[PDB]
Ligand binder design. Structure first.
Ligand SMILES: Nc1ncnc2c1ncn2[C@@H]1O[C@H](COP(=O)(O)OP(=O)(O)O)[C@@H](O)[C@H]1O
Ligand SMILES: [Mg+2]
Ligand SMILES: [Mg+2]
Ligand SMILES: [Mg+2]
Lengths: 164, 356, 164, 187, 164, 187
């Protein structure tokens, strides 16, 4: 295991999971999808301010929240993710968050072992999360059908405001 | 004249003549095929073992005809068309299977008269009782059948996939921890013999393990067929302990001590008192020395303190289901209760439902 | 099943269950408790004239009808029974008959299976009987409290003219 | 009961994980037959009634006469073992318990709800059973909305989404004044 | 291989293995233990009518079926055998047939090779037989314990109606 | 088995010293064929498959169809004589023993390790055999890292080289307090 989580990531998770009554001007800077990284010393899980996605921009500059999110993951390193999905089922309309464990084969072993052995140190601190998505290849995470297969299986008819 | 009794066991087919003290033909129920040797021949020989009676219900009918043909010709050494054969079926048996069994028996072997009985009621009658839950823990399954004045309640019959087969598999797994590698089918028979001759249920598993980890008098010595002498330590009580703690195998279902309580609580509230004091055990798996005391302790821990639990275990509970059928078929007043071939010709295979 | 009942046992049951106006000299030879057995061929249910209890003798030679009845049952064989109980409840005074199924463990299986599978052949012919008492161990049938527990439970305060 | 009757064919679903698969099979392949005894006769002979379900691990299991036997318990509780009458007779017993002058508006206004009443063909069976039970003179009309599974939630959502319902709620001030007993007076 | 089986031996095996309902006068001439031999030309497996054992005589003239059977085998030639054993186990009472391959060292090689290479030609035609007993020395086949060791091992407590 | 089949050509390696040469030959010239029966057909006719190994004493021995026959035992253990199924069927038997809902993530996450899985072309054969065994609907993905020989050691080395792992070790003081049973609680 080893690596633990910092206070900023826990604060961001508590901010994203539990939303409250907010003003229409502030509600547009909420966090939609944020990744997690390691510092220089590889001892804390820190979010990078560079790569991120806001809730405000979704549907505007970012035509597709998921489509613009696949290319945001670096293919030469291991990364965490937290995607807020809005999928439509035959039964009803749900809005859940997804934990994506990005781990390509092109990354070095030093970045794969650290992120694989410390996954229980981050997932345990993220209380209330259900949808877990482990993705190693890039083609499997690039496809749109896999998210509906993991979320609800064949029941999900539409994903992110558009049908499958 | 004499009647045959072919008990369709999940792992051992018991066959013999009515009136005897024990079955004559006892062989494992396997139909070997290479990549068709049935029964005892498959163990000696490169074949894929198949069980048509794996879980108490006949799912592979094609091999049951070969099983019965072997049992009649190469095991009982008698003609089936000249001797009536009594058959036993596992509880919760569908009507289609009950009809197919008698249809096959009447159309293939052309036996003049047959009868189908329930294993639970036979095992209960063999213990001098008519009302009481019977524990049928065989080789493939473990059934808890509560019976009221000879009428089993089908809604409270609990079925457990934990049986002697999983116990033998767990013994094979835990014997490799010491260094004894039994992986092939030939060594499986030696593991089964070790389980039958040296295993016992402890009164307290956690306390017994404490003494086994320190004392050396518990270690026994078994003689392999090739002359080697292997020693078994704390594996004598760990193997039958799975019946009460199925976490050893991995199934989430509760042990045989809690499924009995769950089945008793499912019957009528006014007949629960006669079921706690009439728990009867049967099957070859319940032959471990000291299982009745452990069952009584666990039930008294589970059941209310006011009512008393009496667990009776006859010494012949291994073949009690066959002895009951043999005595029922050896009756001088039972020759008129059989299902003759004429009644079958008149009523089709559905005659067994009305007669039984 | 197999074994059926003879005419003598049915006549005895009809004689015991339904009593009529009788003379004081004849009323003392009525049947109080009679057992049932099997013949040499084990095909009919026959009562043995040897072991029996009269109504006349009860309260005289037989100080206790139940106490002298336990030892009358053989412990090495299975037997039927028919006991006419006179118990006192808190609510009232009742007089019913009890069917005792004696089946010890020391008896051979040939005598246990025959008597257990043919119990419906005898109990069905005994119309109007309610109190059924199945006893296997000897200690459970020897105790006096079990009869009051089966008959009326905790309500029976006195059994056979004497309190519990 | 579906878990119990699926083991008769050879499908052993005993754990909690397989219980979800059994529930999905019951939701996707079970249906109430108009006549149970007649339907069983055709199911014992015909082979077109047997469906095929895909397990999460890729296995394809076939279900035969268990499609109509599972929901048949609602009308014949002897399958489970309870002595209580089926849902077709408890309704008649409850209607006969109300006023005699309002029984006519109850026979023609039988509404079904809950997720269990989502079986295709349950309304026809209910109507047949009630017409067999109820007198012949009066008519029985059984209406079954297609959204009866979440109707109890949709009703509350529409009641709470009213623009004139914001003044009917129980605010915290009234609670502080009246204790927990305010819900009895307000509702 | 070479040597095949005749019709008489197959008929005798089918007669011995599968018994049927027979009259009490005819049941006493059934075949208990029969040996097999070769003709003048050594091309067929034929039973010799001279040396044999009936079921009727067992227990009468032949006090011991096995004891009188050892001396029946010639020590200067190779022979087949088929013994119907009636042994008692701790578990139960069984009645099986035993295939005894008698092959002493004093026999010439011409009679040993023919009977050893054609053993699969006779054993394959005897369907349903399980207990195989290969005996070369005379002392090993003369002993009574070896039959119980091959049949059931240490479990056989009694052999042929008498304890070990 | 390689020592046994090399004597069929005339190369007698019986001693422990020649066993190292046999192991080097197995490590440098053996490979798993995609189809054993088809590969043997071409090996019996073609001559380009025969390689040449240099013994430590200077002798040059040629190996023919023994390049793919030696690792073929892992899929057909009848070559050695054990009745247990090959490594391609034990995997399927173990996957079918877990939960039914997690079997899908086990078929697409088969990882190979150990020095024996270093044969070129074993991943394709494993995938083919599993796809033949597993249901057709679900897909099988077999990933084989190039460093799978020492992956079990590299993992431990990286886990022990962590700057935040120095507080997770079992120091001697905790051992003195808790006996040898401390490893069960800590690990
Ligand atoms: N004395 C014994 N001790 C322990 N296990 C036994 C003993 N006798 C039999 N068994 C077990 O019982 C199993 C056979 O049960 P079986 O008689 O086939 O049950 P059923 O008749 O209900 O199918 C065997 O697998 C064996 O392991
Ligand atoms: Mg049994
Ligand atoms: Mg509701
Ligand atoms: Mg390793």
């Amino acid at each position: 295991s080893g690596v633990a989580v910092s206070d900023g990531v826990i604060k961001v998770f508590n901010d994203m999971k539990v939303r409250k009554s907010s003003t229409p001007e502030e509600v547009k800077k909420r966090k939609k999808a944020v990744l997690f990284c390691l510092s220089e010393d590889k001892k804390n899980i820190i979010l990078e301010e560079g790569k991120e996605i806001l809730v405000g921009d979704v549907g505007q500059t970012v035509d597709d929240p998921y489509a613009t999110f696949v290319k945001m993951l670096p293919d030469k390193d291991c990364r965490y993710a937290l995607y807020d999905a809005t999928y439509e089922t035959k039964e009803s309309k749900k809005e859940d968050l997804v934990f994506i464990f990005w781990a390509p084969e092109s990354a070095p072993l030093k970045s794969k072992m650290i992120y694989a052995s410390s996954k229980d140190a981050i997932k345990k601190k993220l209380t209330g999360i259900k949808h877990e998505l482990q993705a190693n290849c890039y083609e499997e995470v690039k496809d749109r059908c896999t998210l509906a297969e993991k979320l609800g299986g064949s029941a999900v008819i539409s994903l992110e405001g558009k049908p499958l | 004249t004499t009647a045959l009794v072919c008990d369709n066991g999940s792992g051992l087919v018991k066959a013999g003549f009515a009136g005897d003290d024990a079955p004559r033909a006892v062989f494992p129920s396997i139909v070997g095929r290479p990549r068709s040797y049935v029964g005892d021949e498959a163990q000696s020989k490169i074949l894929t073992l198949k069980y048509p009676i794996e879980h108490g219900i006949i799912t592979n009918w094609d091999d049951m005809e070969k099983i019965w043909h072997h049992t009649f010709y190469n095991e009982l050494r008698v003609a089936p068309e000249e001797h009536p054969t009594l058959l036993t079926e596992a509880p919760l048996n569908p009507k289609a299977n009950r009809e197919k069994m008698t249809q096959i028996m009447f159309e293939t072997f052309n036996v003049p008269a047959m009868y189908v009985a329930i294993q639970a009621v036979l095992s209960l009658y063999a213990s001098g009782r008519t009302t009481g839950i019977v524990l049928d823990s065989g080789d493939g399954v473990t059934h808890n059948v509560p019976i009221y004045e000879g009428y089993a309640l089908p809604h409270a019959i609990m079925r457990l996939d934990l049986a002697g087969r999983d116990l033998t598999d767990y013994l094979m797994k835990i014997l490799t921890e010491r260094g004894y590698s039994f992986v092939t089918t030939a060594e499986r028979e030696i593991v089964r013999d070790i389980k039958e001759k040296l295993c016992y249920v402890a009164l307290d598993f956690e306390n017994e393990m404490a003494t086994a980890a320190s004392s050396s008098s518990l270690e026994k010595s078994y003689e392999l067929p090739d002359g080697q002498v292997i020693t078994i330590g704390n594996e004598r009580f760990r193997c039958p302990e799975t019946l009460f703690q199925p976490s050893f195998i991995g199934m989430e279902s509760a042990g045989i001590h809690e499924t009995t309580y769950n089945s008793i609580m499912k019957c009528d509230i006014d007949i629960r008192k006669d079921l706690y004091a009439n728990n009867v055990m049967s099957g070859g798996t319940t032959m471990y020395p000291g299982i009745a005391d452990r069952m009584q302790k666990e039930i008294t821990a589970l059941a209310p303190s006011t009512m008393k639990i009496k667990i009776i275990a006859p010494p012949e509970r291994k073949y009690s289901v066959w002895i009951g059928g043999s005595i029922l078929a050896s009756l001088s007043t039972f020759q008129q209760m059989w299902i003759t071939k004429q009644e079958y010709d008149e009523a089709g295979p559905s005659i067994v439902h009305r007669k039984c």
